[PDB]
Design an enzyme around this catalytic site. Sequence first.
Site, PDB file in Angstrom:
ATOM      1  N   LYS D 163       0.808  -1.211   0.000  1.00  0.00           N
ATOM      2  CA  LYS D 163       0.000   0.000   0.000  1.00  0.00           C
ATOM      3  C   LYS D 163       0.845   1.266   0.000  1.00  0.00           C
ATOM      4  O   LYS D 163       0.349   2.327  -0.396  1.00  0.00           O
ATOM      5  CB  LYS D 163      -0.951   0.005   1.196  1.00  0.00           C
ATOM      6  CG  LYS D 163      -0.282  -0.112   2.544  1.00  0.00           C
ATOM      7  CD  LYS D 163      -1.321  -0.134   3.655  1.00  0.00           C
ATOM      8  CE  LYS D 163      -0.857   0.642   4.872  1.00  0.00           C
ATOM      9  NZ  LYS D 163      -0.282  -0.251   5.912  1.00  0.00           N
ATOM     10  N   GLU D 189       1.022   4.394  15.468  1.00  0.00           N
ATOM     11  CA  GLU D 189       1.443   3.188  14.769  1.00  0.00           C
ATOM     12  C   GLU D 189       2.903   2.887  15.110  1.00  0.00           C
ATOM     13  O   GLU D 189       3.495   3.507  15.995  1.00  0.00           O
ATOM     14  CB  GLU D 189       1.223   3.341  13.264  1.00  0.00           C
ATOM     15  CG  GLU D 189      -0.205   3.075  12.825  1.00  0.00           C
ATOM     16  CD  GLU D 189      -0.615   1.630  13.002  1.00  0.00           C
ATOM     17  OE1 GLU D 189      -0.420   0.836  12.061  1.00  0.00           O
ATOM     18  OE2 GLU D 189      -1.137   1.283  14.080  1.00  0.00           O
ATOM     19  N   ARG D 190       3.478   1.914  14.408  1.00  0.00           N
ATOM     20  CA  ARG D 190       4.847   1.491  14.664  1.00  0.00           C
ATOM     21  C   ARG D 190       5.849   2.500  14.119  1.00  0.00           C
ATOM     22  O   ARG D 190       5.647   3.083  13.052  1.00  0.00           O
ATOM     23  CB  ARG D 190       5.100   0.123  14.039  1.00  0.00           C
ATOM     24  CG  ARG D 190       4.105  -0.933  14.456  1.00  0.00           C
ATOM     25  CD  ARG D 190       4.314  -2.214  13.680  1.00  0.00           C
ATOM     26  NE  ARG D 190       3.311  -3.219  14.003  1.00  0.00           N
ATOM     27  CZ  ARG D 190       2.062  -3.200  13.561  1.00  0.00           C
ATOM     28  NH1 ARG D 190       1.619  -2.224  12.790  1.00  0.00           N
ATOM     29  NH2 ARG D 190       1.238  -4.185  13.901  1.00  0.00           N
TER      30      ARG D 190
END
Lengths: 78, 79, 563, 470
Positions: D163, D189-190
């Site tokens: 993506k 997020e990470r």
Amino acid sequence: IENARKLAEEQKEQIVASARAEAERVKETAKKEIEREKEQAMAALREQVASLSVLIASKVIXXXXXXXXXXXXXXXXX
Amino acid sequence: KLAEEQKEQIVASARAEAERVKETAKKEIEREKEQAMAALREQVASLSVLIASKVIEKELTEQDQRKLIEAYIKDVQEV
Amino acid sequence: AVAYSARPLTDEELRALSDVFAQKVGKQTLEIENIIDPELIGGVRLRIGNRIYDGSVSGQLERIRRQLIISALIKQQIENYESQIQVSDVGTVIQVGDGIARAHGLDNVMSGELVEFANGVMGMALNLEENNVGIVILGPYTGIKEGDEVRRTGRIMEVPVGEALIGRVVNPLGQPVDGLGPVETTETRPIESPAPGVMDRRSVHEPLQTGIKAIDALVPIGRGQRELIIGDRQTGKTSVAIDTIINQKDQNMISIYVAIGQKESTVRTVVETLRKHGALDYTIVVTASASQPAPLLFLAPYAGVAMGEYFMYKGKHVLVVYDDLSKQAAAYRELSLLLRRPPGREAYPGDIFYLHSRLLERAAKLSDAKGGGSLTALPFVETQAGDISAYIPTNVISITDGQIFLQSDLFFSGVRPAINAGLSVSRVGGAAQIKAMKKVAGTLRLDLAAYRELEAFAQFGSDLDKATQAKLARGARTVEVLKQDLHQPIPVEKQVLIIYALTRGFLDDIPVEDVRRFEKEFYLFLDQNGQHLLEHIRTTKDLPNEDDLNKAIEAFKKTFVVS
Amino acid sequence: TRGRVIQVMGPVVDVKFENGHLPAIYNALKIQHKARNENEVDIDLTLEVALHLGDDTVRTIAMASTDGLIRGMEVIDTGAPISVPVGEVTLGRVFNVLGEPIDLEGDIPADARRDPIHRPAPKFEELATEVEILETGIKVVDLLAPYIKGGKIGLFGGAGVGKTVLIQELIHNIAQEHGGISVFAGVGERTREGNDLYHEMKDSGVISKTAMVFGQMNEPPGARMRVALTGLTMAEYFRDEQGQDVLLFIDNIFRFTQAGSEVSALLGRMPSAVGYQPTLATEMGQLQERITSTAKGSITSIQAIYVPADDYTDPAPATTFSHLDATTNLERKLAEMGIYPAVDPLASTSRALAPEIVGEEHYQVARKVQQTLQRYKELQDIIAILGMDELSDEDKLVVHRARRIQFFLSQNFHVAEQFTGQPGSYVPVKETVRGFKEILEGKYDHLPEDAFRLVGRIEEVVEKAKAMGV
Ligand SMILES: [Mg+2]
């Protein structure tokens, strides 16, 4: 049949666009005239409002002095 | 003749819509005029408030004190 | 007690005011304190407890500045003299946050009253405690701070009401949001008003024509009913509502569309769709989008029904649509939890059934003594993953007079509208139908019921040649007839005639892939050489003679060329 | 003037001020302290006002760690909400929630323009009355799931489907054609994936037209729930001042809502269903209503959403799904077989696929392709497998055209030219409608399937098959 419908659609779109252009020109001219009238009325009704403000102060509580003082205050504010 | 009849009906509907659009533009002009008149009146009112405040400040308060006291007493009597 | 003055007051004046107020109120003795704040101009405002007496400059002066917006006439007649004393009952804010506020004071405030904050935002008193009042703010609350001042207006919550609202877009307080100028009405109606009584009603007999064949044939709706439209998102319920609204062009109805918790862009496009089809000559739109405070979302449906009742009580017929009744419930739950009211199942308050039943019981059909008007309601409820066991979905199902079910499987495949007749009911029934539709719809219902059982086993043919593939063909022909396209509703006589053609066995020769084109060309044919059957159905409300109908359908079939 | 600290309970602080000097809600306050002895540590903290509790006290949420705070510290009122820099100085740089660069290229001068983080949504009278289609340049998107100016799109997918390549391709195509910029916001997020994306964007070269904001898992709840607003206010400047069409990517919208709940109970609020904050839909609506298409420009947002345990009835996905216009599904099955992008054609949905929006021709072509693919999916599985193969007429041709159409949805991207010599193409929508219609009619039925692979316009396909010996 289909060609007639297409021609009718083109004519209707052109007529609507022409009316829209006329309306836009009329609106622009009206806005310009309204701005000019707004400026002129702002000046005139500002002098009148200074006089009426002296009058309202007197009513809540000579004329030339009060008008001159109101005009000076308006000039200072502007 | 059905296609031509539908074409004429569509043209008449478009003309009616154009007339409605012109009427709406006139109504928009009227609304703008009303707004401009209101704005002019509001500016006049603000200038009048400032001028009246200045005039009242310039005015003496010796009789104003007695008049205010009497008015407050009358207000107390009323309510 | 406290007196605000431009300059400090004299001792004699202070004593005179103290004596005057002690005598007027009836108190033993008053200790009067004065201030020298020059915010006022040569005037004093006095505060006795929570009562304010105002006779100062920028007080009554503003009272004539705010009024009259002839100018010299008022300046010399009524603006010169103070418009009496400005008396108010006030309070003091002590807590602000999350859209609510609590105040000290407001001794004589009513339950449900409207209060006005210092900066100009409104609020509604909802919790009268022993020593404070809980207020829900109907606007932006970031300008309100602790120590502010609130005042009573003295009026229960109410909305503007009149004929000037037709074709306009307003918010639940009755204020325009389309920017076309002010709305000029002369009446108001309280938002919370009682429902018509048991003996003030009459049975439902007149029909409400929607234009969708599936609804008009299998789930009819009468004038005065309350039908629920339930389904998941991505099923197209707004399209059903918009087609129903458009169809009422020449049926003498006033429509009201209420949008609760929707996107402003979608509301704008919906209003633009309504304007193009000329449906804004009898429609009113009330909107409370997702960015608005929760009390507005909770108050919108009541405003819509209050505007409808004005026309209802004069002999007219109204139709009200509620975009979502679940968003209103969520907003009410948020308000209740923020006010520290005991929760229940899924944290909803105790009176969550009351909130919706009291609203949906205001739709009625009035008797001849009260005028004969009516009000029809079409509430929407959205489910998640097709689960109708949830608290609100079961609450609203048990109030209404039947429901319409829309499936997400049929929507994706391309079936418009995705109505399910196996779970849709209408308890009013055939009393909301015309004689022709009654005589025609029973066979269609039976055929669809028969076809729905064997639809899943079409892969395995070689079944009983007698009455299995014949029923499959009849069912496929039925399913193709009930399909439709967005906008373009259909007149009831045309629906009756096509369903008659399908049920009498006039469509077996035509293959499945040509049924839609067959019905379209049949509609075109009837407009030219079927000009008397339609008039007979319109004038008499009964379907024409069987032999004439058979001859007409036989004559059309000879011209229709089948591919 | 200055307040003092009263309580310190996790990420929530209480401050007491003087009478008649309380800050407004949403204001920002600063603590700047230097140790007076060895029993103290230096403090540099920013707080945001949340509630007025009465008695000159306010309850605030901290934007960083509160370790080292002492009851009695002195707090300064800034006078306005959090303010971030806006303009051309934010292009190609990385910021944090407070609007400070976390790269090592310098500081923004103090004599710049800074916009506040909180503002109301655009009004009814200044929105777009017409639905307009956004031109991306991809072929599967522009045919089976068109995008909308000012709409919201939900992107579904994970690892191994690529993506980030779609993200970069969208950025490049939009910037090249429509002259727009992009803003990326990473919300809880990470950090490893953030570094990966930053270096990929540096390699491609699309960094000079993007602004990146990061608040990730390591940060307190307060910083995770106010980072999407910083990206939003960075993006709104271009729409409202340059009149551009902007893209806004959101790494995980779900985390946003989650962060709110993590502070709700600490602020003194009764819980709603499934332990969520009572003010959930209001917060999501106040966020998502600021991205629209006004009369000047537009903001279109692509948002990645994670569903907890694949439970779509959870309150947070259920609340955010009512704002979406389209969904884009990335499938590993199509990536294994060599279809790029891996967008699923039978699971992607859009509300713009209607004859009144795109057109009658577009709608007919798209529906024909969809039903052909559905027929292929049904037939090729239960039949032609398990030794039940058969060669019926009109079933040879259906699979023939279906295979020739499934491979024409793949495309060659500009950002993939660093690993492959093909320059890449931008295909308008009329061209792909024409190509798909021609394939459907069977005009191009006399060519091998290898010609329909990694190609733009339909005519170029012929040239491919010209060089393949056929
Ligand atoms: Mg829907």
